[PDB]
Amino acid sequence: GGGKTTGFGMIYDSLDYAKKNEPKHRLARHGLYEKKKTSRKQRKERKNRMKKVRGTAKANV
Amino acid sequence: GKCRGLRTARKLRSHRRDQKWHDKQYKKAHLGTALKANPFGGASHAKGIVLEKVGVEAKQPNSAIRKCVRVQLIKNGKKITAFVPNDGCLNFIEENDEVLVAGFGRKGHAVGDIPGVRFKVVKVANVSLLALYKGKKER
Amino acid sequence: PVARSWVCRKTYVTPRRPFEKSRLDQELKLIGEYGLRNKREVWRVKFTLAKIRKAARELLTLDEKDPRRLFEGNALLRRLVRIGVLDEGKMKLDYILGLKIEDFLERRLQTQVFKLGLAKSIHHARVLIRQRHIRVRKQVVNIPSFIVRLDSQKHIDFSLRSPYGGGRPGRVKRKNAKKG
Amino acid sequence: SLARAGKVRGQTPKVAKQEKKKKKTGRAKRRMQYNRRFVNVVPTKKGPNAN
Amino acid sequence: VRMNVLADALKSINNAEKRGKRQVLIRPCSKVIVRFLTVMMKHGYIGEFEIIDDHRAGKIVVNLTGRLNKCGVISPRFDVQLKDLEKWQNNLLPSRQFGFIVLTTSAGIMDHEEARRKHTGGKILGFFF
RNA sequence: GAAUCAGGGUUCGAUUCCGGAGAGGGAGCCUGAGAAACGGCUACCACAUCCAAGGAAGGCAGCAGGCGCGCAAAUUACCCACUCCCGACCCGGGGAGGUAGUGACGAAAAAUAACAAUACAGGACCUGUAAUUGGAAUGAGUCCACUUUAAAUCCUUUAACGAGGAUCCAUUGGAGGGCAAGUCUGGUGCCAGCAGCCGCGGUAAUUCCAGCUCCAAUAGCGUAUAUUAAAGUUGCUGCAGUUAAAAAGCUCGUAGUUGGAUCUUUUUACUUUGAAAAAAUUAGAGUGUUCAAAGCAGGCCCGCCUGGAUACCGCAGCUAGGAAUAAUGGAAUAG
Numbered sequence: 001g002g003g004k005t006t007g008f009g010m011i012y013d014s015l016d017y018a019k020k021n022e023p024k025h026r027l028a029r030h031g032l033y034e035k036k037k038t039s040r041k042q043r044k045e046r047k048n049r050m051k052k053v054r055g056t057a058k059a060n061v
Numbered sequence: 062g063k064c065r066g067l068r069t070a071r072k073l074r075s076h077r078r079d080q081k082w083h084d085k086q087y088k089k090a091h092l093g094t095a096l097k098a099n100p101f102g103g104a105s106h107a108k109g110i111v112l113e114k115v116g117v118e119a120k121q122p123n124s125a126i127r128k129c130v131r132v133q134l135i136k137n138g139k140k141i142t143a144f145v146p147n148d149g150c151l152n153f154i155e156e157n158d159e160v161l162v163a164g165f166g167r168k169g170h171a172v173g174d175i176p177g178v179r180f181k182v183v184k185v186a187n188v189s190l191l192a193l194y195k196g197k198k199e200r
Numbered sequence: 201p202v203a204r205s206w207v208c209r210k211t212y213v214t215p216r217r218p219f220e221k222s223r224l225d226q227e228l229k230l231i232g233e234y235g236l237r238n239k240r241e242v243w244r245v246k247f248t249l250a251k252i253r254k255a256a257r258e259l260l261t262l263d264e265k266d267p268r269r270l271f272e273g274n275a276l277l278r279r280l281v282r283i284g285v286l287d288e289g290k291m292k293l294d295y296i297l298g299l300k301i302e303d304f305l306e307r308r309l310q311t312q313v314f315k316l317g318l319a320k321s322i323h324h325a326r327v328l329i330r331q332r333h334i335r336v337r338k339q340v341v342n343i344p345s346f347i348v349r350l351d352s353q354k355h356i357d358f359s360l361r362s363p364y365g366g367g368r369p370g371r372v373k374r375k376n377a378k379k380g
Numbered sequence: 381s382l383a384r385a386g387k388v389r390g391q392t393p394k395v396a397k398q399e400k401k402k403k404k405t406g407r408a409k410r411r412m413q414y415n416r417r418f419v420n421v422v423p424t425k426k427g428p429n430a431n
Numbered sequence: 432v433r434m435n436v437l438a439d440a441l442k443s444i445n446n447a448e449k450r451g452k453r454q455v456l457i458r459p460c461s462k463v464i465v466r467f468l469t470v471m472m473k474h475g476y477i478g479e480f481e482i483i484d485d486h487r488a489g490k491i492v493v494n495l496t497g498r499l500n501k502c503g504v505i506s507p508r509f510d511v512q513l514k515d516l517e518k519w520q521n522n523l524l525p526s527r528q529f530g531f532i533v534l535t536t537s538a539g540i541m542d543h544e545e546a547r548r549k550h551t552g553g554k555i556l557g558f559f560f
Numbered sequence: 561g562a563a564u565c566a567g568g569g570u571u572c573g574a575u576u577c578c579g580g581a582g583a584g585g586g587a588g589c590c591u592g593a594g595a596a597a598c599g600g601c602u603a604c605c606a607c608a609u610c611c612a613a614g615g616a617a618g619g620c621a622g623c624a625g626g627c628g629c630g631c632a633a634a635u636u637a638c639c640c641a642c643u644c645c646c647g648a649c650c651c652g653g654g655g656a657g658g659u660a661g662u663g664a665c666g667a668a669a670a671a672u673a674a675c676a677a678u679a680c681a682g683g684a685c686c687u688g689u690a691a692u693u694g695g696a697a698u699g700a701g702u703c704c705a706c707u708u709u710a711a712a713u714c715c716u717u718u719a720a721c722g723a724g725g726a727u728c729c730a731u732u733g734g735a736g737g738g739c740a741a742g743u744c745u746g747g748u749g750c751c752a753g754c755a756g757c758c759g760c761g762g763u764a765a766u767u768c769c770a771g772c773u774c775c776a777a778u779a780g781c782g783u784a785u786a787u788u789a790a791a792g793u794u795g796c797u798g799c800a801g802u803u804a805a806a807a808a809g810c811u812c813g814u815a816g817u818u819g820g821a822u823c824u825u826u827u828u829a830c831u832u833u834g835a836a837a838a839a840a841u842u843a844g845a846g847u848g849u850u851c852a853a854a855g856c857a858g859g860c861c862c863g864c865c866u867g868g869a870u871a872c873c874g875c876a877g878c879u880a881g882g883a884a885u886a887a888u889g890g891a892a893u894a895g
């Protein structure tokens with residue numbers, strides 16, 4: 001019927017606390033958090049290749 | 062009459078379990094002989110291959126020629142006869158044609174004036190025979 | 201495993217006889233009087249009554265000083281009165297058995313829109329509900345089967361966004377005036 | 381003799397249908413059934429498809 | 432042979448009732464019958480009954496008012512809890528307005544309306560209405 | 561637990577919770593607190609994969625996917641944000657789980673018109689009928705934006721458009737009887753066909769094939785098969801057994817079943833009560849998810865108030881009252 005929406009609000013004391021104890025997607029909605037761009041399918045193919053190589057030669061794989 | 066005493070439950074329960082076998086609907090659903098004898102094998106439908114178009118004469122007083130097909134099943138190789146229900150739906154079927162058959166109404170019994178026939182064709186080459194009849198689809 | 205609920209029930213029982221002309225005409229009168237779309241809505245109200253009666257006939261068999269008869273009997277009576285299908289003078293448990301399904305069809309929103317003169321026909325009243333022109337106290341309701349409680353009987357009113365109650369006339373009336 | 385098959389359906393003369401008024405559907409169709417049976421209380425029982 | 436004395440008592444009262452007789456012999460008198468007849472007599476279906484002592488299981492002469500429809504026994508004496516008592520009521524009694532199911536509880540041989548008041552179950556003897 | 565259900569019952573429960581089992585078949589073990597582990601080894605059988613023929617590697621009844629089998633069953637999608645788990649851990653990981661797609665398995669809600677004036681019909685000023693007329697109302701759809709969320713999508717919200725044959729078109733089955741609805745018209749002539757059942761059709765078919773009408777239930781509706789009620793046609797409640805299906809040729813007889821009266825007017829059975837009994841489901845309380853299926857939420861002007869009930873849970877075992885009914889026990893060589 002319109003007119004009324006309802007949500008949640010969370011007022012922090014200082015912004016360093018709000019960087020400290022917040023979900024990182026909620027901080028990323030304000031442009032503060034920068035996750036890296038890698039699909040988990042891309043990130044799991046890389047892991048299984050690293051288990052076939054032993055030693056310091058994992059780094060270039 | 063019947064025993065009524067307070068400790069006669071075993072006499073009553075065992076006499077009942079023996080006398081359940083004397084009617085038809087319990088006997089055929091618990092021997093497994095009739096389950097061994099229908100070609101569906103306890104299923105509702107079956108796909109088969111039309112071997113032959115066969116003409117079955119109607120039981121008297123009816124005097125027509127009931128158009129049926131002689132079908133070998135894919136599931137178990139049993140050869141049955143299925144009826145082709147409608148005006149001129151034999152012309153949609155060919156030989157070596159893969160049909161879907163179902164029961165014909167009386168749960169394994171023969172129906173109507175067709176002697177020894179208890180099945181009917183539903184789909185003909187993955188197309189329902191009701192749609193070929195009403196012109197909904199084509200072969 | 202999943203975090204999903206599967207609790208569901210049906211709301212109607214189809215009658216045992218398919219064709220008796222006594223019952224077919226009897227269910228036709230309720231449709232014409234109350235603007236119902238199909239006979240499932242007659243059966244849903246008929247099924248609602250029968251659950252109340254089974255809850256009633258169970259409680260008539262206990263003695264009058266059992267705690268369960270006093271508790272669930274009174275919680276059944278109060279739920280009937282706050283929706284208006286039962287009078288406060290008739291607050292004994294036996295009077296539930298005298299009720300008809302025309303008392304629950306009287307308490308639809310589609311009925312009570314028309315019987316407050318907000319509509320011109322009971323076929324007209326069901327149309328105004330589905331098109332969001334009717335509100336109860338602050339809520340726009342597009343459900344004709346809304347059982348309106350006796351507490352909110354006064355608060356049935358036209359909507360605010362509606363052209364019938366408030367401003368901003370509908371898109372037919374505007375584009376006629378846009379052409380002129 | 382499986383020769384004659386589809387005989388009467390083929391020998392039926394083909395009559396095309398008449399494109400006509402749309403039937404009302406839903407609550408309004410039940411409005412007609414309530415009106416045509418319980419508002420027309422003309423004196424007279426005849427069935428509704430009588431010829 | 433005679434396995435149940437209460438059954439032969441109530442069948443003989445029931446047969447003499449529909450024959451329209453005023454009095455009836457009840458052969459062997461047990462104390463269960465005497466306690467059964469008093470429950471029928473306090474609710475008033477039979478008149479005063481005379482018990483005859485003959486230095487064995489005696490005889491009872493019963494005056495019949497003409498009010499009885501059917502005095503029946505239930506065999507065997509099924510144990511009945513208070514949960515199940517209302518299911519015996521609409522299988523034995525013709526109405527919820529009259530008729531009685533006779534129980535034998537630990538507080539004595541009772542009709543079913545008294546056993547609800549006393550809040551106890553028992554074995555069922557018979558019924559009358 | 562589920563479906564059916566007057567009371568009793570009958571049938572189902574592979575299937576998200578608890579418990580068990582097995583990881584192609586069997587067998588043997590290592591490590592460890594915990595395994596006879598299989599996303600650990602070791603054999604042999606079955607199968608199958610690379611190969612330079614010397615050898616090497618295998619276990620989707622994990623998520624997806626494919627083949628096969630069949631009447632019969634979905635995307636090789638996104639994410640650890642929620643729920644939780646593991647680790648040395650506030651940071652890592654999770655095809656557990658979550659979110660989308662396919663989804664007429666099913667369940668809840670609910671459009672496909674409403675009104676007014678005429679033309680008319682009626683009824684004792686009210687109502688009905690119309691391929692007549694009239695501008696009023698809206699969604700479907702299109703579509704910015706917000707919101708939603710891990711990022712999205714959908715719903716909710718709101719602009720922009722969006723209806724007259726409102727062509728933005730409702731089907732599925734029927735119309736002899738059971739059983740709601742035609743002795744309409746045309747064709748066919750025991751043919752083709754229908755028909756669960758009785759039946760219909762051999763030249764005026766109330767039943768076929770069609771058109772017209774009509775009925776039923778409606779975004780659903782036929783059909784096949786399992787099964788429940790109907791079925792007092794399995795009968796404990798509750799069936800029959802002279803002639804309809806049926807009491808053994810006759811008697812004895814052990815199990816089994818059942819046992820007369822009697823007394824205050826020892827062990828049990830019984831009855832009542834108490835405990836202890838996993839949630840979910842069912843019954844049911846409270847609560848306007850816009851209603852309802854649901855959900856356990858919510859409500860009231862710095863915060864405050866308040867719920868997250870109760871019942872039921874055969875039998876067996878335990879506990880305390882009752883002592884009728886029903887068994888049983890004491891003193892006869894008095895030991």
Ligand SMILES: [Mg+2]
Nearest residue numbers: 581582583597
């Ligand atoms: Mg294992």
Ligand SMILES: [Mg+2]
Nearest residue numbers: 583584620621
């Ligand atoms: Mg396998």
Ligand SMILES: [Mg+2]
Nearest residue numbers: 583596597598
């Ligand atoms: Mg192993």
Ligand SMILES: [Mg+2]
Nearest residue numbers: 599619620622
């Ligand atoms: Mg695996």
Ligand SMILES: [Mg+2]
Nearest residue numbers: 632633663665
């Ligand atoms: Mg499927």
Ligand SMILES: [Mg+2]
Nearest residue numbers: 201623655657
């Ligand atoms: Mg999963």
Ligand SMILES: [Mg+2]
Nearest residue numbers: 664666667780
């Ligand atoms: Mg549905």
Ligand SMILES: [Mg+2]
Nearest residue numbers: 405672729730
């Ligand atoms: Mg439409």
Ligand SMILES: [Mg+2]
Nearest residue numbers: 735737738739
């Ligand atoms: Mg019929």
Ligand SMILES: [Mg+2]
Nearest residue numbers: 788789790791
């Ligand atoms: Mg049945």
Ligand SMILES: [Mg+2]
Nearest residue numbers: 789790791792
């Ligand atoms: Mg019954």
Ligand SMILES: [Mg+2]
Nearest residue numbers: 792793799800
């Ligand atoms: Mg019989």
Ligand SMILES: [Mg+2]
Nearest residue numbers: 803804805806
């Ligand atoms: Mg005989």
Ligand SMILES: [Mg+2]
Nearest residue numbers: 807808809810
């Ligand atoms: Mg003899």
Ligand SMILES: [Mg+2]
Nearest residue numbers: 434436820821
């Ligand atoms: Mg005795």
